Design a protein around this nucleic acid. Structure first.
Ligand SMILES: [Mn+2]
Length: 176
DNA sequence: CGGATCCG
DNA sequence: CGGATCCG
């Protein structure tokens, strides 16, 4: 995959917002734009992008086996590099060039944890998770855990989650 | 099928 | 830090 400018990345994301679907028992089901979240370095507003990352919120657990393994993009030709229920890396054709598109899935209850994780950057997440680890927690893209048991937090949004964990909220571009 | 190498 | 996917 080639490099994208921030503007080029946003044009691709806007194009894909209405064009993602998946096959379920032989029927095409379109993914709702509200269930597609730009994440990764594009969400952090980096000037150049190595790839475009999209998080797909899956409303029902029964569909995880179906969404990414049967993912479809209207119009654009693409190839599958790797694909499973949780991560699918595609090489898409866009204006006569090939780019890397990373798709990730989160279930509804995981959404703020997934937004936090997939926004990154890695260095930011490592220091936050290291701090929680010393207090006997484990943080991942699925939830907050203590002794491998989910700790349910009274939060809905990524912002609420970051503050409930004990950290000041930073806008994505300022996370480092 | 698991060490290697991806993903944030 | 923590997790996902598959080449070999
Ligand atoms: Mn990325």
């Amino acid at each position: 995959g080639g490099m994208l400018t921030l503007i080029q990345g946003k044009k691709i994301v806007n194009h894909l917002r209405s064009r993602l679907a998946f096959e379920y028992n032989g029927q095409l089901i379109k993914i709702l734009s509200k269930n597609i979240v730009a994440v990764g370095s594009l969400r952090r507003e980096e000037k150049m992008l190595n790839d475009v990352d999209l998080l797909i919120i899956v409303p029902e657990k029964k569909l995880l086996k179906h969404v990414l393994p049967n993912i479809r993009i209207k119009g654009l030709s693409f190839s599958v590099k790797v694909c499973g229920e949780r991560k699918c890396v595609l090489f898409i054709e866009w204006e006569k060039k090939t780019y890397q598109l990373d798709l990730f899935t989160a279930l509804a209850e995981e959404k703020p944890y997934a937004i936090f994780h997939f926004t990154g950057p890695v260095s930011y997440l490592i220091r936050i998770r290291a701090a929680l680890k010393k207090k006997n927690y484990k943080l991942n893209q699925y939830g907050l855990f203590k002794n491998q048991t989910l700790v349910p937090l009274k939060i809905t949004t990524e912002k609420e989650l970051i503050k409930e964990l004990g950290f000041t909220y930073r806008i994505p571009k300022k996370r480092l």
